[PDB]
């Protein structure tokens, strides 16, 4: 990383045309201007700040997989809650443990230790604000042109006369006195944009709701009260009755889609997705396509699908529709005609 740190501020020197005209490339017709550097720090924020939590978790997700604290039914499980926790991004389609979208990148698919970017990132910002004021040329601040400025490189030469004579935090203290690291020069060069995040982002909403999805709307909360229909002396609901249910949920789609939609699509109990299992047999659920799992069933047809076979499932567990709560689906029946 260290090498990358000084090398990509030298690939910055590859990206500048200032010594290119004084090492013998194209003549200037493109002289620079003034204002941009108050809004250029915005552009650095989309690059250098946008990649910090994303590249952190994927190495941390890889390690607990690698040391075996994550069983092999939990990869896409462990992939997304940390993207909801650390990044606060969400998947647009729920993923089972087949897809392995972590493998879609370059360096995971081709075996790179991806923590090389964090070390170089830390040493890089401790250096630049402490040194290149004396780089003998500063118009635009990214033009700290040590090419034709020897004086700044000799404070840099205290690390440069060394190979692997020792660690690097002694090479850090040869320059800026760093001993482990500091996040402060990250925070200092974004300190003009820390308060500016209360200038154009003054209007305050803090944090996020850490569980929203754009497919959470199609999930249905079902609410079972065994102390309401069977009451006591009833059977104790456990993971079998979880497994009984999803079979009998899958029932309702087959009975719907051929008596109403009138074509056959198959359904397993595993298509009934279970989320937030609670003792009170309460949980929000939704069903997908069988193995076109990129697409899910729209809830608007599931609402009429339950109302067709609502009478089928309460006696499938000796219940009374006040122990089959759906919160959006309610029984609409019962006109009496007792007198002749």
């Amino acid at each position: 990383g260290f090498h990358e740190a000084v090398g990509e501020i030298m690939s910055l020197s590859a990206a500048t045309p200032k010594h290119l005209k004084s090492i013998g490339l194209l003549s200037p017709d493109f002289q620079e201007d003034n204002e941009t550097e108050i809004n250029f720090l915005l552009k650095q924020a989309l690059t250098i700040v946008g990649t910090l939590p994303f590249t952190y978790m994927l190495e941390k997700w890889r390690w607990m997989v690698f040391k075996g604290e994550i069983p092999k039914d939990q990869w896409m499980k462990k992939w997304w809650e940390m993207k909801r926790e650390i990044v606060g991004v969400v998947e647009p389609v729920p993923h089972d443990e087949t897809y392995c979208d972590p493998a879609s990148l370059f360096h995971v698919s081709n075996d790179y230790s991806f923590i090389r970017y964090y070390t170089r990132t830390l040493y890089q910002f401790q250096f630049q604000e402490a040194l290149c004021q004396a780089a003998k040329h500063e118009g635009p601040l990214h033009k700290c042109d040590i090419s034709n400025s020897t004086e700044a490189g000799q404070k840099l030469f205290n690390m440069l006369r060394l190979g692997k004579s020792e660690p690097w935090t002694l090479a850090l203290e040869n320059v800026v006195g760093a001993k482990n690291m500091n996040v402060r020069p990250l925070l200092n060069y974004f300190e003009p944009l820390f308060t500016w995040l209360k200038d154009q982002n003054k209007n305050s909403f803090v944090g996020w709701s850490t569980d929203w999805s754009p497919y959470a709307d199609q999930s249905i909360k079902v609410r079972i009260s065994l102390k309401s229909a069977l009451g006591d002396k009833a059977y104790e609901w456990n993971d079998n009755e979880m497994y009984l249910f999803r079979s009998s949920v899958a029932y309702a789609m087959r009975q719907y889609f051929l008596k109403v939609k009138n074509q056959m699509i198959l359904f397993g109990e595993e298509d009934v997705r279970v989320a937030n299992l609670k003792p009170r047999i309460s949980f929000n659920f939704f069903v997908t396509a069988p193995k076109n799992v990129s697409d899910i069933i729209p809830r608007t047809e599931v609402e009429k699908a339950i109302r067709m076979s609502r009478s089928r499932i309460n006696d499938a567990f000796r219940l009374n529709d006040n122990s089959l709560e759906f919160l959006g689906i309610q029984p609409t029946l019962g006109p009496p005609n007792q007198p002749p």
Partner: protein
């Protein structure tokens, strides 16, 4: 158990109020949305009626708390 969700076995007219303290301790936010209907005998014995309602809108209710409710 609506908002704060205990297992249905480990809740009764009991440490319900004590587990409510653990519910308010685990979270006060959802605890500020669960309204509870306080009740008492002599808050149910304190209502009454005279003249006509005792047999017409009072006795017929407990008539309907019988297994042979149309017979009595």
């Amino acid at each position: 158990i609506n908002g704060f969700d205990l297992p249905e076995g480990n809740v009764t007219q009991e440490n319900f109020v004590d587990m409510q303290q653990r519910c308010n301790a685990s979270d006060p936010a959802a605890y500020a949305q669960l309204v509870f209907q306080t009740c008492d005998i002599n808050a149910f014995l304190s209502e009454a009626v005279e003249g006509t309602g005792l047999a017409f809108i009072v006795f017929t209710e407990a008539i309907t708390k019988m297994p042979l409710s149309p017979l009595w």
